[PDB]
Design a protein around this ligand. Structure first.
Ligand SMILES: [K+]
Ligand SMILES: [K+]
Ligand SMILES: [K+]
Ligand SMILES: [K+]
Ligand SMILES: [K+]
Ligand SMILES: [K+]
Ligand SMILES: [Mg+2]
Ligand SMILES: [Mg+2]
Ligand SMILES: [Mg+2]
Ligand SMILES: [Mg+2]
Ligand SMILES: [Mg+2]
Ligand SMILES: [Mg+2]
Ligand SMILES: [Mg+2]
Ligand SMILES: [Mg+2]
Ligand SMILES: [Mg+2]
Ligand SMILES: [Mg+2]
Ligand SMILES: [Mg+2]
Ligand SMILES: [Mg+2]
Ligand SMILES: [Mg+2]
Ligand SMILES: [Mg+2]
Ligand SMILES: [Mg+2]
Ligand SMILES: [Mg+2]
Ligand SMILES: [Mg+2]
Ligand SMILES: [Mg+2]
Ligand SMILES: [Mg+2]
Ligand SMILES: [Mg+2]
Ligand SMILES: [Mg+2]
Ligand SMILES: [Mg+2]
Ligand SMILES: [Mg+2]
Ligand SMILES: [Mg+2]
Ligand SMILES: [Mg+2]
Ligand SMILES: [Mg+2]
Ligand SMILES: [Mg+2]
Ligand SMILES: [Mg+2]
Ligand SMILES: [Mg+2]
Ligand SMILES: [Mg+2]
Ligand SMILES: [Mg+2]
Ligand SMILES: [Zn+2]
Lengths: 24, 80, 206, 127, 155, 60, 98
RNA sequence: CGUCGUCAGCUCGUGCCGUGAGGUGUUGGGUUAAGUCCCGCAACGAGCGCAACCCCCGCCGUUAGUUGCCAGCGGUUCGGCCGGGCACUCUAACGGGACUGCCCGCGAAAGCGGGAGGAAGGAGGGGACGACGUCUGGUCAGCAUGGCCCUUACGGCCUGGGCGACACACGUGCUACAAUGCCCACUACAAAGCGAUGCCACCCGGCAACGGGGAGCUAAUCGCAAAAAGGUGGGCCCAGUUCGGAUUGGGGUCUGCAACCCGACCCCAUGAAGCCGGAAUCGCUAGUAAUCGCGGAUCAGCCAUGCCGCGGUGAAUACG
């Protein structure tokens, strides 16, 4: 969930971007 | 998962002081207050006394120690 | 241990700001530290004149500084030399080089900043606290005003135990916004300690 | 020719223009069931008509912006009710009871300090 | 509620059966305010009551709610010495509130893997006199009546 | 606000990092707003006196 | 056509001294785009009332910057007369272009 | 500044009663959110407080068009894109309106119940605001200040360490234990804010963090920007798992003189406890609780899951 660094929610919650949450 | 970048850091107090001990020998002991300086090849063999915030600890340096900071061998806290 | 500063609580209405000049996120903190150094040395000088306020306005490298006092003849000096050395402190401080004015106070007994400053001095001279207060209120309440109130802290009379003396007349509806209640806090460094003096004056409503 | 009542809800503004015709409703271009659908709610926005008995007589061009869809769904409930008033005012005498004309004042309450969410207060032990 | 008598809330009738009772049940099924997802569920399950029954879902639903309503329940009350479980009539409104709360509760205790199925089967099983909810209703009713000896604590 | 500490004012901190803000009025280190140069306390006192232009008691 | 923008902390020191730079342009130039509002930039400061602990008190402070537009269509050289240097606002700042 | 406590109170002046402390007034009946108002009364009035005057949010009108619209006509690379126009949305400024006025009933009155009209009633919803006083309450490490004490040091500069210690115990929280769920893809509605060595469009390299290049922006005209939950499709199929992301190994980005002690961040690998929690105990009465994400203050960076704010979705229940 929001705690998984390697997921979408993981990145949203952690406010970051990357492989698992591309900057579009 | 450590990091530094592209320009490894080392304080020049010894960076050159150490290499000078190579220019004419090797010497004995050294005293630093830069536990923040990376360890590089030219240090191996030497024996540097790193400050643990209270004293200067005799830290012998080996090949398998390069890359590590000096502080990593001079523990600051005294426990049980 | 409560109560909003009667002034700050009204800045919106029945009370305008002292420093009323515009600025931007890069100037502001600067054009402010200035006013403080202004009122700073400004207040440690025009003390005897009795300053009930210090306004300030700006447009660009220009600063009003409409100093309100009850004894103008102290900021003027010998015929008019005081106002000279003073406007010299101005430019040597704020290199902005700006004007300066003076506004007499029509009865320094309707300006709490003074009524309080008064009691403070009396106290600093070993006056009789409960009396001074009692009188000051009477003085203020005598020359107009719909109400007034003075409050001195503790150590009243070098007493080892701090207290708080009262006194107040007429109305002083602190909860009413359209009040228009001047407020002034006078310190009072004495031999044994320090005493706070607050003054409230209710000058008409609406 | 045309009719138009605004309508607002929980910070949502809806432009509702009723025009004689079939009854195909548009919303920001998309078809009614195109801007909504998947929202069992939506159907209610067109309740104003059903009440007065419209539907088969008016078409509707609608603009919608601000807040969230269920909110919009309600602002539109007013548009179609306010515009439907300009048409025949004898309709107001039929939407009063239903209350479709009433603007819904219910809004998000301010987040106060000391609290976690305006009212939700932090928990304590006392031991 | 110390001062007033607390009036009851009114709910917008169902966007389908145009029934208020349905919305009530919908809200009990709701969770974290996801009223959409909540509504779906009742509906899908509402369909599943057919093609399993030739009857209308609403009639099924409304009669399940009925068999789960408790007519007596035991409430506490200290009378010097301890607490005596006192039996007593259940108000027309609490009956409904209890009935629905219980259905969603029993429903979610079922093994059926997906929501709509669970509400559906509980709805059905309830309608004919069986199921978690009805069990509860009977344990309660049995509680009261099992304490007839404290009936004189009316209140 | 110890004095030997109001040394802060140093265009020559040696390292931009060590350059910390302080309260223009009290020397207070923590809670020193940037738009005013003042600290959290001073900011409230002055705003009350009306000396902070525009600054008003917000309510909504 | 001269783009005008009036900013300030006072909603009267602008809204008002924004008609002086419109009336003094109604009879000397075009019709002017009248005075245009523009949203405000409210900056809030939330601080703790007491000087030590008691972090659940707070009290709020805002410093809202109001804005105005105007815009005088037709760079009337006859309007530049009444204007130029004739006003009464002290707590204002102007930003204008062509 | 916190606190009982937004509690409905605390007093005064004169008169009257009492040898006196004091009392009456402020008690009583009705009523109210209220010492709110009514009636009564040796009291008649008054101050602090309540309420109101202020801010925000609900509806409407006036004034104003570099933000909105084929509403409406024409052009369209069919994007409000251009002409164009301020009706609409909106922006921000002034003003309107609600008073138990308005109708039936009860009532001595205040006011209570109910309806009509209205966007809204009866304190419409939320703030700012918190009496005389209490707690020898909190802070002399914000600042101020009496006394006291140190004045090659209880002052000062610096490098390094410490405030980050860990057998343990508690508080406040975060993420969970899953199918009303998790994942991937695609697609949709927000508000309030911030932005010059600043937000960073768009482009290229990199799985990515980010790096190189670089348009616009003094910012209703450009950027932070994606809102998320939601909708659609596909997957997982009840398993400690495609639940959950602790811990640890490796590689690397970035800020900064410098990340060992002691930063955040990306990627690979690892993949812990946890199957809804004993006694006990906390919050919340409506757009609230619950749930979802968004901004800011401080700030190089950040240990923020904190704090102060914004809007989306949106309950249950209150006999008493
Ligand atoms: K969750
Ligand atoms: K609490
Ligand atoms: K009474
Ligand atoms: K109100
Ligand atoms: K004390
Ligand atoms: K549980
Ligand atoms: Mg996972
Ligand atoms: Mg995920
Ligand atoms: Mg002495
Ligand atoms: Mg919310
Ligand atoms: Mg000092
Ligand atoms: Mg720093
Ligand atoms: Mg600082
Ligand atoms: Mg407190
Ligand atoms: Mg009250
Ligand atoms: Mg007598
Ligand atoms: Mg008396
Ligand atoms: Mg008396
Ligand atoms: Mg008495
Ligand atoms: Mg009595
Ligand atoms: Mg009263
Ligand atoms: Mg209007
Ligand atoms: Mg009446
Ligand atoms: Mg009668
Ligand atoms: Mg009040
Ligand atoms: Mg103490
Ligand atoms: Mg202490
Ligand atoms: Mg600590
Ligand atoms: Mg905990
Ligand atoms: Mg690429
Ligand atoms: Mg699926
Ligand atoms: Mg797993
Ligand atoms: Mg399981
Ligand atoms: Mg709790
Ligand atoms: Mg930051
Ligand atoms: Mg950490
Ligand atoms: Mg955040
Ligand atoms: Zn300070």
């Amino acid at each position: 969930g929001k705690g998984d660094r390697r997921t979408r929610r993981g990145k949203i919650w952690r406010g970051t971007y990357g492989k698992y949450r591309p900057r579009k | 998962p450590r990091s530094l970048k592209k320009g490894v850091f080392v304080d020049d107090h010894l960076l050159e002081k150490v290499l000078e001990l190579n220019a004419k020998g090797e010497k004995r002991l050294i005293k630093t207050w830069s536990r923040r300086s990376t360890i590089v090849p030219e240090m191996v063999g030497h024996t540097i006394a790193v400050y643990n915030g209270k004293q200067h600890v005799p830290v012998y340096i080996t090949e398998n120690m390069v890359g590590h900071k000096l502080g990593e061998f001079a523990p600051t806290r005294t426990y049980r | 241990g409560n109560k909003i500063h009667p002034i700050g609580f009204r800045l919106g209405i029945t009370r305008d700001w002292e420093s009323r000049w515009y600025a931007g996120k890069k100037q502001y903190r600067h054009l402010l530290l200035e006013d403080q150094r202004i009122r700073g040395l400004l207040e440690k000088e025009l003390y005897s004149a009795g300053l009930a306020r210090v306004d300030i306005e700006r447009a660009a490298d220009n600063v009003a500084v409409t100093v309100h006092v009850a004894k103008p003849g102290v900021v003027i000096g010998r015929g008019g030399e005081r106002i000279r050395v003073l406007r010299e402190e101005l430019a040597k401080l704020t290199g902005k080089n700006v004007a300066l004015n003076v506004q007499e106070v029509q009865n320094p007994n309707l300006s709490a900043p003074l009524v309080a400053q008064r009691v403070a001095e009396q106290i600093e001279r070993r006056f009789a606290v409960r009396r001074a207060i009692k009188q000051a209120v009477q003085r203020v309440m005598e020359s107009g005003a719909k109400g007034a109130k003075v409050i001195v802290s503790g150590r009243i009379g070098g007493a080892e135990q701090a207290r708080t003396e009262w006194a107040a007349q007429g109305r002083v509806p602190l909860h009413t916004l359209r009040a228009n209640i001047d407020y002034g806090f006078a310190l009072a460094r004495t031999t044994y300690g320090v005493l706070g003096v607050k003054a409230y004056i209710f000058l008409g409503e609406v | 020719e045309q009719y138009y009542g605004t309508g607002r809800r929980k910070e949502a503004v809806a432009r509702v223009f009723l025009r004689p015709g079939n009854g195909k409703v548009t919303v920001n271009g998309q078809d009614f069931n195109e801007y909504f659908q998947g929202l069992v709610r939506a159907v209610a926005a067109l309740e104003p008509l059903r009440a007065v008995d419209a539907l088969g007589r008016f078409d509707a061009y609608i603009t919608v912006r601000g807040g969230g869809k269920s909110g919009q769904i309600d602002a539109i409930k007013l548009g179609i009710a306010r515009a439907l008033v300009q048409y025949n005012p004898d309709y107001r005498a039929k939407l009063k009871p239903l209350g479709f004309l009433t603007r819904d004042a219910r809004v998000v309450e301010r987040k106060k300090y000391g609290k976690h969410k305006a009212r939700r207060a932090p928990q304590y032990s006392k031991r | 509620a110390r001062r007033r008598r607390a009036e009851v809330r009114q709910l917008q009738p169902d966007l389908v059966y145009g029934d208020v009772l349905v919305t009530a049940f919908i809200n009990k099924i709701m969770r974290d305010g996801k009223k959409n997802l909540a509504a779906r569920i009742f509906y899908d399950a509402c369909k599943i009551i057919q093609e399993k029954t030739g009857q209308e879902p609403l009639k099924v639903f409304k009669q399940a709610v009925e068999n789960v309503k408790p007519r007596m329940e035991v409430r506490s009350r200290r009378v010097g010495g301890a607490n005596y479980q006192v039996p007593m009539e259940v108000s027309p409104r609490r009956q409904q509130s209890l009935a629905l709360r219980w259905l969603v509760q029993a429903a979610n205790q079922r093994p059926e893997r997906r929501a709509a199925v669970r509400i559906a089967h509980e709805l059905m099983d309830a309608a004919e006199g069986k199921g978690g909810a009805v069990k509860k209703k009977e344990d309660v009713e049995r509680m009261a009546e099992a304490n007839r000896a404290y009936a004189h604590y009316r209140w | 606000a110890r004095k030997a500490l109001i040394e802060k004012a140093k265009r020559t901190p040696k390292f931009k990092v060590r350059a910390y803000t302080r309260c223009v009025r009290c020397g207070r280190a923590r809670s020193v707003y940037r738009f005013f140069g003042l600290c959290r306390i001073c900011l409230r006192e002055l705003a009350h006196k009306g000396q902070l232009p525009g600054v008003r008691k917000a309510s909504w | 056509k001269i783009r005008i923008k009036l900013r300030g902390f006072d909603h009267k020191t602008l809204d008002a001294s924004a008609q002086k730079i419109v009336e003094a342009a109604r009879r000397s130039g075009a019709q002017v785009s009248g005075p245009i509002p523009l949203p405000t930039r409210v900056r809030r400061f939330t601080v703790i009332r007491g000087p030590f602990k008691h972090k659940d008190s707070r009290e709020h402070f805002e410093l809202r910057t109001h804005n105005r537009l105007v815009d005088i269509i037709n760079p009337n050289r006859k309007t530049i007369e009444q204007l130029m240097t004739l006003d009464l606002p002290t707590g204002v700042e102007i930003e204008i272009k062509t």
